[PDB]
Amino acid sequence: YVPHVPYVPTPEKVVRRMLEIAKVSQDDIVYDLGCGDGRIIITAAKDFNVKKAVGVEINDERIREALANIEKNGVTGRASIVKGNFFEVDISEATVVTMFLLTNVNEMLKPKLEKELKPGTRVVSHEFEIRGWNPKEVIKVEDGNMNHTVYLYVIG
Ligand SMILES: C[S@@+](CC[C@H](N)C(=O)[O-])C[C@H]1O[C@@H](n2cnc3c(N)ncnc32)[C@H](O)[C@@H]1O
Ligand SMILES: [Mg+2]
Helix, strand or coil: CCCCCCCCCCCHHHHHHHHHHCCCCCCCEEEEECCCCCHHHHHHHHHHCCCEEEEEECCHHHHHHHHHHHHHCCCCCCEEEEECCCCCCCCCCCCEEEECCCCCCHHHHHHHHHHHCCCCCEEEEECCCCCCCCCCEEEEEEECCEEEEEEEEECC
């Protein structure tokens, strides 16, 4: 089995602000690349009423959490998990893509996004500047003692 692996979730306030910044609404399909405990797709479904939210995650410890959290939050009808490497998972149906990634995956991520996402798709990232792209918005989010940066991109 896969042993314990540390992770970094996005604080709840930053999750909300990300979805606000991307103007997430009911008609949206939200994909979270590396969804961890599922909080972004759960909040999108629970608080922003999205028709569909899909979390992609490779770590089974995280997936087990996320699956339970979906039930605990009463959003099993609209939120789901895809087990896999998000580089290898089809995200083309997304109208909004969220990311909080702490490794240098920029060079790899850019071509998959341009290839699979339709023009007008919004990409919103927590402290992940996408090198070579021009952000529509760069927003500082104050979170108690903590500060965060959120980037918004619009495909095309
Ligand atoms: C920084 S945590 C963020 C979790 C969540 N999106 C949030 O903001 O609260 C990054 C997550 O991405 C997952 N991850 C990293 N690389 C991945 C990959 N290639 N495919 C799927 N998941 C990945 C990790 O296992 C971890 O759960
Ligand atoms: Mg932060």
